[PDB]
Amino acid sequence: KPFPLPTGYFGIPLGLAALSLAWFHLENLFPAARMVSDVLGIVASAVWILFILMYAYKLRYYFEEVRAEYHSPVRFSFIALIPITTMLVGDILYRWNPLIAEVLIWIGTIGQLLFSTLRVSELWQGGVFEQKSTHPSFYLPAVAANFTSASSLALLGYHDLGYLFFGAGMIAWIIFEPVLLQHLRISSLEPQFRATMGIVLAPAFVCVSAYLSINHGEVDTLAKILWGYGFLQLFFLLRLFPWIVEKGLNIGLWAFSFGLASMANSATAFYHGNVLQGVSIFAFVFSNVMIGLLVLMTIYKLTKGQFFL
Amino acid sequence: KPFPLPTGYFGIPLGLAALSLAWFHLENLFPAARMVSDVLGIVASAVWILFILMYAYKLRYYFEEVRAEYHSPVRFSFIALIPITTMLVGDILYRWNPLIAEVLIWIGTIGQLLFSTLRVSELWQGGVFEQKSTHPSFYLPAVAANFTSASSLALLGYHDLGYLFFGAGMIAWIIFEPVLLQHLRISSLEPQFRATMGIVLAPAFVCVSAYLSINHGEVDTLAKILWGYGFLQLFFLLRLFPWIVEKGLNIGLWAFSFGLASMANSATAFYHGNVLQGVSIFAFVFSNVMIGLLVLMTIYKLTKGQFFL
Amino acid sequence: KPFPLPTGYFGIPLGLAALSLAWFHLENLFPAARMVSDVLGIVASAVWILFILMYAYKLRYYFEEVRAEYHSPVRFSFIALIPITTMLVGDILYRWNPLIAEVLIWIGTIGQLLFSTLRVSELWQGGVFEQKSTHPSFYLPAVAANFTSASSLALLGYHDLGYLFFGAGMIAWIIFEPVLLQHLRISSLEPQFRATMGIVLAPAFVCVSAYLSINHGEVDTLAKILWGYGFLQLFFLLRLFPWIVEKGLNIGLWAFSFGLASMANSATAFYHGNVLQGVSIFAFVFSNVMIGLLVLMTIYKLTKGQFFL
Numbered sequence A, B, C: 001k002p003f004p005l006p007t008g009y010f011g012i013p014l015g016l017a018a019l020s021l022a023w024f025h026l027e028n029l030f031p032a033a034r035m036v037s038d039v040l041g042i043v044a045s046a047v048w049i050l051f052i053l054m055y056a057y058k059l060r061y062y063f064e065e066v067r068a069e070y071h072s073p074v075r076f077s078f079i080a081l082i083p084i085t086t087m088l089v090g091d092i093l094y095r096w097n098p099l100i101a102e103v104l105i106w107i108g109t110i111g112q113l114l115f116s117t118l119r120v121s122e123l124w125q126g127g128v129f130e131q132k133s134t135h136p137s138f139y140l141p142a143v144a145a146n147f148t149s150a151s152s153l154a155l156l157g158y159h160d161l162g163y164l165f166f167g168a169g170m171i172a173w174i175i176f177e178p179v180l181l182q183h184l185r186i187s188s189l190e191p192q193f194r195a196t197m198g199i200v201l202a203p204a205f206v207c208v209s210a211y212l213s214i215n216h217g218e219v220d221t222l223a224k225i226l227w228g229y230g231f232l233q234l235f236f237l238l239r240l241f242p243w244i245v246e247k248g249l250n251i252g253l254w255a256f257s258f259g260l261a262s263m264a265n266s267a268t269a270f271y272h273g274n275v276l277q278g279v280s281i282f283a284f285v286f287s288n289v290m291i292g293l294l295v296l297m298t299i300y301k302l303t304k305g306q307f308f309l
Ligand SMILES: CCCCCCCCO[C@@H]1O[C@H](CO)[C@@H](O)[C@H](O)[C@H]1O
Pocket: A066, A067, A070, A079
């Protein structure tokens, strides 16, 4: 029974892929991390292939649904999950086949940049985006995609180009967040969108993870500054969690996985650098437990026919 | 005749304590600064003890008044003055008794973080905070408290944890200020709140003072950048001063003391580092004259029964 | 036939002067750049003298028109073009006469700082500036003027004072842009103002150019971060260009020249530093072609009596 794949489902392979990469970065300290990384990376890649095929089906047979999501000043953002996940799968595959990895990384980089250049800029024409369009999902095309390009290009050796993407993401983040948080303060995000509060966890941690990927894992003043704001936001979101899930636990909670996985990834670098190793251990374990709970809730939802539309 | 202590009065020991610390940092250049520092520190500590006892009385006998201030999306911020001043008094007392200092510093740090995690985040639920709630006082829990933790923890030797608090404050500052200044441009702050424009002086100077405390007094590019924006804001506030006091000079002007004291503190580090020593001298003298005028106006108000509620 | 000079016309000598300085910075790599720099610098200086004389005439004989522009919460910003161009002409003239250069640089620096301190701060009184006043032109007094002071003072040897102005501009930029872009998203900028979207190109490139001028041309992490966001904005504005010129090509397009010239200037430093030399060459050529097109369209407009009011 055909259905149009909800684009947000790409957050699942995104979170798993990012978590694979976190474990990969533990390999030199703890060799057993290699197997955990490889298993997460294969599962993420397989889910990504499936969802890419489903989205190709959506494009072929439900094109007007894609067109409507693209032109929406809110829903367009989830499309950025496609190139973001494509790059992360490339990053995973690099351990086995750098040529294929490089192809995926460049496709995702050119894709995300074309996407933002076409759609993010178009918002500045005014009159379509409304105050109520000011949602955490906007971080995906505006911020997360650039950080992912930055870290992926660094992996391929393009450190200076990586810094360009890094800067685009970092400054875009601090330029958007002020108006997002003011909007949230004034207007209550409706329950149907609240799981996307998890995306608010992502910026600082995705930022510092990308930064450390480009700067050879040097845990410097900037990295520590970023981690601090990251943890502030974590604490805030923990306090907000009962409100986030007021209307029940749902699959949208995968929104938190990107920030959680990036907190795990950045923890490996802090630990390697002998900076706040206790905090690093807590962060790494915490993020893995939470993503583990997402996986278990997702298997549960699947073993009952409550997964796809 | 019992009364509920207005929470804002903690700005008095706050400003005096911060100024004690500024003079403390002049000791190695000018030994006579020691006595001035110690006198300011004892006076600040004594006033703090008195106000803590008064607030304990408020909690015991005027609890509903505290509850109302806590739940207000505007008035809650002044409560952050309590842990901020507790930490600064700890910092003062460190010169005489590090054990007692450490207790006060940790109580104020855990207290402020718990306070923001409970209340600052709760605003993001929407519908309580309004555009008109966008006031300079929000810098206290969001920004100043984190900088104070950063510098206090650095004093105790916890430089990396200090950088985490520093980053939380710095990024929180740049995330809030944009919407504050836009709000002020559009909506005239009512005279009763205008003295709190003095808090707008604080961020850059409290930021750079905390930064220099953590980075061993190294006056680097970041420090100079911060000072520049700090002085811009000083100039702006000087030009605005007749509007700020349109309806008369009042005790609320202690709002300026935190930024003034932090400008004095940071001046000592610039001077030590042989950076802009002339500017440093001007800044240090200017801040002391202005706080001196606050003290004289406050003694005046007291010698007439116009101090407490 | 007397007329009041539209203040925005100062953008012409501004763009040409900035471009002269870009070519000046190519001299050590390519000696022929000297002549191109000198020709652009003489033309910019001559146009600046003419426009200064015209504005002096405006002040003498059309003072109420100046007063109205000054008090406008939108139109005041263009006045900042006067001290900005004065400083850039000083920077040009430094190659021939440092004494005269120093006079112009200090006049423009004191002038711009006095101007912002009087007018930018006055906006914070509220009730005059409206949401609809949130225009790209605000970058001129708030941001561009400080960067120009920073680079001009560095030229004269005042590197630490230069960093103060730099910081004031950089932090002012990130404090304003968030609310500008949110405003543009919600409200369509009217065609008559759209050419000023070109000013949105300026911040990152003017910032990095000023930074590199102060830090001895060291292309570091900050510089690369700035360039990245700069290019993001360039791409966005390229995509937006047909909307910008919906109602036709007009002389207001000189708004883009400051950012274009600064992109050329910063390219020379990236090239010198052997960072992204290919990107540097593209940027330098692109900016010169676009400004060349502005010059040709302007000569065209002049050879038909469609230049002044
Ligand atoms: C994965 C992303 C796919 C998004 C595709 C939607 C593209 C825009 O779709 C349409 O194309 C036509 C022009 O070519 C025009 O009608 C419109 O501008 C637009 O509706």
